[PDB]
Design a protein around this ligand. Structure first.
Ligand SMILES: [Fe+3]
Length: 247
């Protein structure tokens, strides 16, 4: 078939991290998914932002869950020409009329523990704005995968970090997925190879990748024939795939 392309945070290295501009630009592009992360605010809002704090990519400091949607909207995103962080409702508006689908990540808080009651709130929100039926859900945490398995019929994918992959080893990663009724894993592109993909598929699991940001990495994913990869350079990915097909 054809390896799908997911725009990492709207295309971080083209448009900045999680910017209205990058999401808008991604919404009009010739790829299949946009990838993004969500966190709650202290007053029940759902904001699109990678880290659980605002420090790294904005001019404001603090944990998103400790602050109001008001304060979060006062923050300005680095390299985002004046942009503020998006709510989920706002993000949904840009994609309702687009052909590109959602790949949502359930990230934990600053303490690394999952947000209590949030998976439900995200599922409600997406249903309320007519995108749930176009969302694939992802997380590094089995606690979050387990909540998703119980709360939704949408596709679920487990993000397997290099540490987990190396330490558990592929055998145990596969056993753990199967034990949790997880039908797809995503590994860091630098930890992927043909043998690993063989082993994963032989167990009945889909195999995708993440962090394919360079020409080398992007080409590796296409040559390997993975199901999907996230990329901070979606423009180049599309161009490299189009050219890979023909070659
Ligand atoms: Fe993510």
């Amino acid at each position: 078939g054809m390896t799908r392309i997911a725009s990492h945070r709207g295309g971080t290295l083209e448009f900045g991290d999680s910017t209205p501009h990058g999401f808008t630009a991604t919404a009009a592009m010739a790829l299949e998914e946009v990838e993004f992360d969500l966190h709650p605010t202290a007053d029940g809002a759902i904001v699109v932002h990678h880290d659980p704090t605002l420090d790294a990519t904005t001019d404001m400091t603090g944990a998103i869950v400790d602050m109001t949607l008001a304060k979060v909207k006062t923050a300005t995103i680095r390299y985002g020409a004046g942009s503020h962080p998006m709510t989920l409702e706002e993000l949904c508006a840009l994609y309702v009329d687009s052909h590109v689908n959602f790949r949502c990540e359930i990230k934990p808080g600053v303490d690394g523990l999952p947000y209590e009651g949030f998976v439900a709130l995200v599922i409600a929100g997406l249903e309320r704005h007519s995108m749930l039926e176009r969302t694939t859900f992802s997380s590094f945490l089995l606690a979050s995968m387990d909540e998703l398995w119980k709360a939704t019929t949408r596709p679920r994918l487990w993000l397997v970090s290099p540490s987990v992959l190396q330490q558990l080893g592929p055998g145990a990663v596969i056993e753990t997925a199967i034990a949790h009724s997880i039908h797809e894993i995503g590994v860091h592109i630098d930890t992927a190879d043909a043998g690993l993909m063989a082993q994963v598929q032989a167990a009945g699991l889909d195999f995708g990748c993440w962090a394919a940001h360079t020409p080398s990495q992007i080409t590796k994913a296409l040559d390997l024939g993975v199901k999907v990869f996230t990329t901070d350079r979606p423009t180049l990915a599309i161009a490299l795939r189009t050219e890979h097909r023909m070659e």
